[PDB]
Design a protein around this ligand. Sequence first.
Ligand SMILES: O=C1CN(c2ccccc2)c2nc(Nc3cc(F)c(O)c(F)c3)ncc2N1
Ligand SMILES: [Cl-]
Ligand SMILES: [Cl-]
Length: 317
Amino acid sequence: AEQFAVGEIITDMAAAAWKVGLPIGCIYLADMNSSESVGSDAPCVVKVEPSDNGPLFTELKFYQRAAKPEQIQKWIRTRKLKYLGVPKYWGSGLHDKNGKSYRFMIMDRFGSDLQKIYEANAKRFSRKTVLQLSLRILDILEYIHEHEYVHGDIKASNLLLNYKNPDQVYLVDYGLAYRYCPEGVHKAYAADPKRCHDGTIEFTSIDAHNGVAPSRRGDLEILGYCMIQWLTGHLPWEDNLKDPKYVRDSKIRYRENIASLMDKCFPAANAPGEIAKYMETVKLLDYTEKPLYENLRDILLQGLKAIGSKDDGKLDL
Ligand SMILES: O=C1CN(c2ccccc2)c2nc(Nc3cc(F)c(O)c(F)c3)ncc2N1
Ligand SMILES: [Cl-]
Ligand SMILES: [Cl-]
């Protein structure tokens, strides 16, 4: 069922006007209202789902609470970042069509996801690429965590490049994000009945596998698994993904003995030491503990020095 008439002008709750274009989720290209058609270079998209769709409501609340353009810009200035890979929220509203009620949200438009590029590079990223990606993901995670949310699902298909700058990566999809610390009150170590999602099996946290709500350590552990996947093309448990008990078992045992994970994943005597140090630091976090993000970034920065590079912001894709 078509939600829009292509080229129609829609007006958000702030009375800002937008024009709808072709699909690019039900997601269409969008631009500011003008006499021009919405082109394939549109700077925004519009996401539209039925008003009872739970994930779009969750996502919209995240973007309204944490991704207001000026809120992001203030953080960038105060923390002296080059950029922050949290997509900007440009507006939202309600759209009725043919007796059905929809919700819409206007967001930044992006270029390619990282999964497409990874697969086009025969399922490897370089050590430089992985460290540069991970430093920027650590900035993103620190930001969302400080604004009471965890992503719980970091992976290359949720990492998009800036449409006009292939050195800037953004983390998307907050439909199943989780508000772990509402009003500064950390959730307890237990399932949340209101949350059904377990993440993506090959990358998800041990916490998620144990049926508890995701927290900050879980996001950092997910990134850990991504790093190994990216560096090596593989994870140890990838042939057993239909059995969650198996996946959890392997992650638990590998966490208890990170040296064995390094031996499994990398050629003998040739493991990148910053990855092990990263995993060891994450292993020391309690369920409610605030990560020392700057120490984690320092660990990755020590890896760039080790390979004769520096954090120059180049993703080398
Ligand atoms: O080919 C595509 C499909 N696609 C996509 C990729 C991965 C996942 C979802 C959509 C795109 N999404 C976006 N924007 C976007 C998506 C979000 F999900 C979000 O939260 C947000 F703020 C912004 N721009 C261009 C895209 N090109
Ligand atoms: Cl803020
Ligand atoms: Cl391979």
